[PDB]
Amino acid sequence: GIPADNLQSRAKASFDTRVAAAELALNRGVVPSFANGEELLYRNPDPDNTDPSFIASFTKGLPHDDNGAIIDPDDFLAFVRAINSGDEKEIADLTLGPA
């Protein structure tokens, strides 16, 4: 018999087209993103303090000291957790602005 394709319904063709596009995107694979290493490199200069300073990270909105360094490293660490979660309550629980 002569090799052939078959028709299907328009609705199934539309579905299959959308899946085929999703499959094309999936089959591209993914690549990691690497940061420049500063976030945990730079440290609070206080000798009795084991915290990063986050001075080279975006911390606009978190409360800063008179030098422009964030006051509480937990504020930035919580901001990072909220970034990765997206949860609205978690976002609303962050510290924004000064006293």
Contacting residues toward a copy of itself, per CB under 8 A: 1-27, 29-30, 32, 34-37, 39-43, 47, 50-52, 61, 73-74, 77, 80-81, 84-86, 88-94, 96-97
CB of 88 to Br ion, least distance (A): 22
Look at residue 6 and give the partner it binds from a copy of itself, Na ion, Br ion, none, a contact being a CB closer than 5 to 8 Å depending on partner kind: a copy of itself
As a whole number of angstroms, the distance between CA 96 and CA 94 comes to 6
Q: Determine which helix (DSSP H) or strand (DSSP E) holds 81, and give its type and residue range.
A: helix 73-85
Question: Looking at 20, 40, 56, 96, which residue binds Na ion (CB under 5 A)?
Answer: 40
CB of 40 to Na ion, least distance (A): 4
Residue 35 contacts Br ion per CB under 5 A: no
> In this structure, how many other beta carbons lie within 10 angstroms of the beta carbon of residue 72?
13
Residue 21 DSSP SS3: helix
Report phi then psi at 13, rounded to 5: -65, -40
Look at residue 56 and give the partner it binds from Na ion, a copy of itself, Br ion, none, a contact being a CB closer than 5 to 8 Å depending on partner kind: none
53 class by beta-carbon count within 10 Å (0-12 exposed, 13-18 middle, 19+ buried): buried
